[PDB]
Structure formats: structure tokens, C-alpha cells
Amino acid sequence: MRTSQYLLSPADAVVISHQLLLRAGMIRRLASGLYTWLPMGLRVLRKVETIVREEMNAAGALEVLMPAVQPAELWQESGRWEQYGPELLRLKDRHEREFCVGPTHEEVITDLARNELNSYKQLPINFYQIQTKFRDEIRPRFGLMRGREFIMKDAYSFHLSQDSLQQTYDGMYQAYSKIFSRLGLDFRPVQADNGSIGGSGSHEFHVLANSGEDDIVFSDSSDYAANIEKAEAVPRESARGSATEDMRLVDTPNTKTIAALVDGFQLPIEKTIKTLVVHGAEEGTLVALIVRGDHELNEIKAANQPLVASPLVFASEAEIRAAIGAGPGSLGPVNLPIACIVDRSVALMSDFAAGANIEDKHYFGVNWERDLPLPEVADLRNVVEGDPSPDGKGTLVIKRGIEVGHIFQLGTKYSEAMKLSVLSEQGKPVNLIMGCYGIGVSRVVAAAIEQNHDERGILWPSALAPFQIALVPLKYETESVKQATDKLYAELTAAGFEVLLDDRDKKTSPGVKFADMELIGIPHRIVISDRGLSEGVLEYKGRRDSESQNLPIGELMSFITEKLS
Amino acid sequence: RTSQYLLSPADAVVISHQLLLRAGMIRRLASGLYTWLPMGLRVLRKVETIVREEMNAAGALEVLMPAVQPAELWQESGRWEQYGPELLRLKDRHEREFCVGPTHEEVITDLARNELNSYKQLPINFYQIQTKFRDEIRPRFGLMRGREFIMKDAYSFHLSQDSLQQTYDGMYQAYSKIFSRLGLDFRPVQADNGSIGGSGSHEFHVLANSGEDDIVFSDSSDYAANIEKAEAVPRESARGSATEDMRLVDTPNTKTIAALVDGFQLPIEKTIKTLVVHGAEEGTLVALIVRGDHELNEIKAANQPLVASPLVFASEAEIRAAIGAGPGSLGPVNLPIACIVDRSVALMSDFAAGANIEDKHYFGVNWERDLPLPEVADLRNVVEGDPSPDGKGTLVIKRGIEVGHIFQLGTKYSEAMKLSVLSEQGKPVNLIMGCYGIGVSRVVAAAIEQNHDERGILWPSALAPFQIALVPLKYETESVKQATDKLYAELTAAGFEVLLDDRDKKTSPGVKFADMELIGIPHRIVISDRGLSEGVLEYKGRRDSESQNLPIGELMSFITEKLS
Ligand SMILES: [Mg+2]
Ligand SMILES: [Mg+2]
């Protein structure tokens, strides 16, 4: 009775995984960013959940299950009750007590550790759960990938020392790598934002897909791998060029953009700069950050600078004019009455053009040292295709990624705030050093399709297929065909395979049945017919296959065993 | 292994709550919100697995529906307001309204509107195992009355009542398979279905003294009903003949059954209680009379057609304006409102009632003679020793923990959210629905409520978190530490769930033993340099009184038989 049950019965879905997940009856919308898992969709979901839980256990983590509803008072200990922003879904109960529906669980698990972790002989320990979160995304979109309710594997490890944290952290990296291999994904772990300049201890796991919202950077020869947020930028040139022009004021009443200098004044874009006035970390101060005309400011690198306020805030036009005496489109490093930091590539420029900090004027032929001192230099830009690999090996390619996991060395941020402390073996109170590890279990189901699909529909990796074999008769009411078919279901089920049986009547044509089984990603099809049973044979076709086959009935069970290998 | 699982009691009053706290199975986050600790999650998953197997074997299809539910769906059924303060409501950042669902009737009916479009897809039975939130006013009893709890909730859809009954019966059978595999002593009982008589609602109850429900059995038949549902028949075959004339008596300080009995030497079976309730017709009142030794069954009262559901008791001001006399002076004689008497009241003779005149009673009232007999109904709770309404035996009342409910819902939601499908002959049909729920969280606690002893938790075999505890005495000795790891592998390879107690010379053997017994592990093996010399392993069962020594080779056989 299987298809007349599992198959059940788009207009806005724009990414392929969302459209296919809806068309294939894997999920359906309830409200904005809230999706029901349909019977066939839940079969795939649980397959993900099984592998992730197996590798978390094999890596020594202890599954727990914490509440969804959480006391605001915990979120007030970390300050995140306010600081988290409008993505936190806040509520009150019938007694006017305040809660959120958790998007994550750092406070709750730290609260647990306060009460449960009392001796150094219990450390290290790593707790994880597979549980529904809520995030009030301002614009839920992309189906399972930017929903509001989604499933998360979130894990939290506690340590007495940095080395202890690293070992567990390394084990999680390895377990994640096992997880996304068993899931049969084309993935890449990359270095990620750790809040600091340089250093380590933050890695993202990405599935490669041309719809990726993350840009991820790779050496074309070395193992270098990093989110563009983190990717160190080093300049292509080896030395600063020599001064070949004098500095001069140029009237620029209508030249206020990189485009206008390059196209209008014919300047090589390598001879232009963008100045970005941001707020200072010192209250009320301004900082000017400068990148070359053909580059962009990396905002994460920007806010990592000690002089720069984190998070990044851009100065207003009125602030800019009050400080500098000129406004956007006429700004530059010369006679700049505010602190400045220039990108590494900008320090090597020569004979370049800058806004003069005089309205409607630029300097042309600026040269560092001759016309003004070089200010502080830092890595402020994003890398671009073909940039040198920062490890000196090869050049950089940028690909698109869907983030499906993140691991992060958290330190003592929560154990300081929530007074989670344990005595070291020598008797010293130690603030527990924490790590956090997350996988977007929901997002994984969708990520797989973004990467594996064709014109016929979903292509599942082997571990995710909701069934392995579809039986399609083809006049299924024929006693001859219904007995061969029902026996075949039993044999194949007996041997352990997961078989979907298409029991729909003649009112559903064979071609439609074929297209349905293909759409839902079932990797093997078997068609039973009286004309083939006469000939003593069975018709086979693979999901990726071009033409069907005919297999002698007697050979079929060995043949399917081989395919499933 | 125990350095990890064991981790390190005040407001706990029922035993399952103290034991779940002390065995490190759960811990509290806030009121009614509890974290499953690693030991606890293992037990809960063993419950879910068994529930899921039997749901699937019964042909139901697992889905997973959102926890946050839009208010507009709840407004279609009227439950957005009607469900009460137990509904957790919120607004998102865009000021749209939702609840955190306590149940999913509207959601699954909404799903069906979009997915059930052909009769060839029916019958169909959807279920999920999913966290609910119910904003209980006074959350208590640990897992038994928390606010967040795990629930297997199922909903089936049908084109005919017969179709529903079949699926309903398979859910009944599957629940029994479930609770049998969970090793519980349960009983299914008839339950309140909304109507007088009839079937279509059964509750599954674990038998325990702490049960909040009263469930009625015959000591002679299979009869089993929630006291809310139990039919009461009188212990009398016939109304007695009149042997007093009716008189007016002054009862100035007589306003309770006890005062009428102890102040006038009347037997309690000659007295009555008159309860004045709101009638279903707007603005009307109905009086409900039971005998002085009985209580009013409020489920039975509300099921009366004249009586408003849910039941509302009349105020004292309302009584006085209607009748002309107050509580404690009420009765059926000269009663200017409609009246319903319990079956037993109808058989009474020579009986006392308030006269509907302040501080007065009639004595020696007799039906037909002094006043006409009103309508008769089954209005009272049964009491221990009552006749069994199937005519086989008398009735006993025991206390039960409700772990499962099945209910024939009909077209309540399909009619309101317009869920209709064309029959094979082309007639539109509102889908008939049944709903089935198992308190998965609650089942864990109900098990301990019925299985425990002086030393801690007793688990039915299917729920034990581990089957074997390895307690190496002096595990720091490398001779014991090798034999035990060797043993851990052998047993884990054999497919047994084994908890190695790796704790050190700090925690004494005696403490280690008590901890393994508290968390309810069925079987223990002690490895020692003592018995290693003798080539022997020490074994003890969780229920046994003495431990015993055991040749090592025989041990793998001995223990596989133990769990057979
Ligand atoms: Mg990111
Ligand atoms: Mg009840």
C-alpha cells in the first residue's frame, strides 16, 4: 500500500532544493519558515540524524536533551537576553515569567555544568543534543536553508586547559569529516572568523554548490582553505613603485567614484583608493580605512583592528564632514585629521589618486613618504581570484559554499559570566574553557539536493535515499503480476532493502509512475509486467541510467545486491 | 564511563521524581522544564523506539510538525481562545501571532486539506513523536505534570465511521503491544467520550497508588472504566412502600447531609443532595439530585441534554432568586425549576429534603404520592462495592496513571476547517478523525511509580539504561584493569549495554554498588584481584539478596541466560 500512502496528494521557491523538496512531497509549508516533514521527507531526515549521532558517540560525546523554552534570567546572565537582537523569539507564560524559544543553548548547558560539573576528574566532557531551535530570521527563505524552526546538532565541551580543549576540538573536526563523508557530500572544511587577527580555532564545514551564500577560498595547490571573511590577503606586487609624477590638485566636481576616475580620467584602477570612515573603538573617535579601487573592505578584518569599533559602524556624512572638512567623494589620506589604516596592497601604490579632503578635488600623483607618511598597514581587503596563496603555495580560487557545520573555541565567555568554576587538581579555581560544535541537520537535507539534482529530480547520496528500490507494476491488478510483485517485495525486504511499492491503479500512467520515482530520488527501479513474466524476465533501470534493462528473474536478487554494494 | 555518565532533593514529593533526580536521569531548568541527562535520555529513547515500532507495524506514517504554530489555524477551530491559559502564546518580530503547541489537531487537519484529495488515499493515520508545551498552572510531580513533555500524537482520517473503528481498534491493539513491551502492569479502561453511553474513548493506565485517576473494575468481569465514565446502577431492585406521611420540619441549623443525619437521627440513605446547575437553554437552571452518601459525577451531569456543558454551578444569588430559598434548604418538592434525579434517588422512600423554604425540611417524602417523579439519569460516581453494570460482580476502585488515550473525534475539525473529500460515488464527505496519544515523557515516570524498592529504581527489562555494570574493585591495579577491559569488550561485542565503573579508590566499593542499584542496572559483575586468583568473577542481580562467585568461562553463558 506504499505509494498510495507515502506520495500523499510552487510559486515562490527559487532555490532548487526547496522546489524539489516541495514537489517530491518531502516537506510542506505551515507558516513563514515553518515546514512539516512529510513521511518521505522524515525518512531522509532520520538517516542524517543516525549518522551524526553515531559519529558524536564514537567521538566520546554524551547525548542529552535540553528544553526548547528557556528562562530569560539565564539569557540575562550572559547579557544575550538583550544583545541577541530581534532573532530571539521571546514570550511570557501565564504567570508573566519571561522565556525565549532557544536558538542555541550556551546558557542552559553552562547552567547544567554549574550544577553537574564539580570535580576535575569529570573533565573533559562533551555534551550534545539533536533538538529543534527557533530563530526569528527577518526574511525566512530558501526552504530548509534559512527557515525559522530547524533541527540542529549542537554540542558543548568543557575543559580545564587550552590543550584539553584543542584535543576535543580536533576530534570534532575529525568526526564532522566522517559525518559529511558518510553523508556522501562534496564538502570542504575551511578556516573561519575567530574574532581575532590571525590565530585559529574556528572552522566551518561547507557543501560546494553554485547557490552557496558563502564565498570560500582555496589554494590551487596547497591545503589552504578559508572563508573569505578569514582568508589572509597578501599583495601581488613585491615592492612599492617609484615616484614618477608630482602631486597636484585636480578639479573633480563630478568625479566621486572609482568608476568616474577610471572611465572619466582614464586612471588605471590600481591607481585609485576607497576611503571608508568607520567609528573608533575609542568612543567618539573616527578611523579611516583605505583599500585599493579594485578591492573591497573586509568588514570582519576591519572590526578586528584594535582602533576600530567592533561591531563595525560606518560614519555618517555629517560626521565625516564635521571631522574632515569635506564629504564622501573627496576624501583621502592627505591632511586627514583622523587616524588612518591602509591595506597592505595600498602601501605599495605609487603615483596614485586620492580625494584631497577638499570638496570637489583630488590629488593625482600621490606618493607615500614623499607627499605624506605611510600610516599603519593591515590586511583590510577581501582576497580576489588569482591572489597569491597566503602560505606561499599557489594562487587562490574562490568557490561558493553552503555552511553545514561550525566548530568554535569559545574560551571562558560564559563560564566567567555565569560563574562556572572547578578546582584544578592542584587546588586552583579554573573557569571552564568551552567549545561549541554545531551541524545544521535540517540544512543538510537541502544542501545535498543543491549539490545533487538533475532534470529528472532529486539525486540522493546513497545514505540519504528514502528508499533503495521502487517496484512499479504495470497492470498490478493482474493476478500473474500481483503475485510476482508481492513476492518480490517480500524477497527484497527480507534481504534488508528498503522498497517502495507503487500500488497506484491504472488511473496513474506508467510514465508518470516512472517520473515520480525519479523525482523523489529512488536510486533503482524495477518494473514487472505480464509480457516480461511470460518471457521470464524483469525490467530494471537505474536513477542515473539512460536505458532500461531486462534481467532473468533468477539473476535479479544477485544483481540488485551488487548495485547496492 | 561512569566518570562521565553519573555527573555529581527538596520540592520532590512523588517517588519517580525523587528517583529521576537522584539517579541523574533529569534535572530541573525551570518550573515544569526538565533536561534529560545522559543516563535519562537512554531510557527515553528505549521508550520511543518501542512506540515507533508499534506505530509503524500498525500502518501509521511518521511525520514531524512544527512546534510554533500560527494563531490563524487555532482561530479556525476557536481553540485560540477556547483552549485557555494553558496555551502558550507569543508574537514574532513581525507581530504575527503563534502558540507553542500543546497538540496538533489544527496543523494536521491543515496538512490534510492540502494532501488528502482522493478517497483512494484513505484511510490514513499520521503520527509524530514531538515535544509539546502545556502551560500547567501548577507544574508538579516531575515528568508527570511538566510543561514541556514528549508525546506521540497520532491522527487518522476516514470516509466512514466503520473505517475509523477499524483503525481505532488497531491503535487499541498497538497500545497494548506497546505497554506490554514496556513491562508495565497497565489496564485499558472505558473513558469519557462526550456522550451518554456509547464507546469510542479508551484510556490506558499504569496501576500505581500515586495515580491521580480513579479507575473502576469488576472483581468478576473484564469491565474497566475511568470513574468519570463508570455506569452506576442502584443496589436496590425496587422503590419502597410509603410508611410515613410527609411533614414540614424546622431545620434552623441543618444545611449539610451530616447535620440532617446527626441532628435528626435520619439514616444517610434517606437524605439527598440538590446541586443547582446552569441549563443549556440560556438563562435556565437545572437541579441535580443524588443521595446523601453519593457525589455528583460532573462528566455525567454535563452530558445531560438539559445541562450546560461544560458544567457551571449556580450562584447562591441565582438559587435564591429562582427558588426562594438558599443552599441547605433545597429539594424537589415545590421546585420551580427543572429537576433530574439519580437512579438511586428514584428508589428512595420516606426521605428528607430541604423544603425550598429557608430553614425547613420535608420528612417522609414519597415519590408519586407527594410529588411526581422527575426525569431519571445516571448522575452519581460509583462507589466501592457497587454492582458491576455488565451484571458480572461488584466494583472496585483503584488508582491509575494515564499513559495513553485514544479518541474518536468525528468531524469536529474537518467541519470547521472545511476538510472534505469526494466519496467513490461523488458525494462530498467531511473526514472523520480519530486521535491517539501516548505520554512518552510520562511513561518513564509511571514506570518508576510502579517499580522501585528501598535501594532505588527498578526498571522493566526494556527500559534499563544499561544491562550490566562492571565494578572493578581496585581498578588502578593493572591486573584488574586488564581483565575488566577484556570483559567490557567481550560483553559489548556480544551486544550487551555495559556501564564500566571507572571511578577510583576515592568512591568506595559500597558507594559504587549503591549507585548502580539506584540507577536500576539489572546485573552487576565485580572484578577483583581476590577472585582473579581463584579464576572467578563475582555476580549479583539487582533484585537478589546475596552475591555469588562464578567461574570466568561460565560467565558469558551465565549472563546471556540471565537476560533471556
Ligand atoms: Mg558564516
Ligand atoms: Mg481524564
From Swiss-Prot, chain A:
Q: Which residues cross the membrane?
A: none
What catalytic activity does the UniProt entry give for this protein?
tRNA(Pro) + L-proline + ATP = L-prolyl-tRNA(Pro) + AMP + diphosphate
Q: Name one GO cellular component term.
A: cytosol
Presence of the UniProt keyword Ligase in the record: yes
Q: Which GO terms describe its biological process?
A: prolyl-tRNA aminoacylation
- Report the superkingdom from the record: Bacteria
Q: Which UniProt keywords apply?
A: Aminoacyl-tRNA synthetase, ATP-binding, Cytoplasm, Ligase, Nucleotide-binding, Protein biosynthesis
Q: Which major enzyme category is it?
A: ligase
Q: Which PROSITE patterns match?
A: AA_TRNA_LIGASE_II
Keyword Nucleotide-binding tagged:
yes
**Comment block on domains:** Consists of three domains: the N-terminal catalytic domain, the editing domain and the C-terminal anticodon-binding domain.
Enumerate the HAMAP family for this protein: Pro_tRNA_synth_type1 (MF_01569)
Q: Which family does it belong to?
A: Belongs to the class-II aminoacyl-tRNA synthetase family. ProS type 1 subfamily.
Biological role stated in the UniProt entry? Catalyzes the attachment of proline to tRNA(Pro) in a two-step reaction: proline is first activated by ATP to form Pro-AMP and then transferred to the acceptor end of tRNA(Pro). As ProRS can inadvertently accommodate and process non-cognate amino acids such as alanine and cysteine, to avoid such errors it has two additional distinct editing activities against alanine. One activity is designated as 'pretransfer' editing and involves the tRNA(Pro)-independent hydrolysis of activated Ala-AMP.
Query: What is this protein called in UniProt?
Result: Proline--tRNA ligase
What is the native source organism of this protein? Pseudomonas aeruginosa (strain ATCC 15692 / DSM 22644 / CIP 104116 / JCM 14847 / LMG 12228 / 1C / PRS 101 / PAO1)
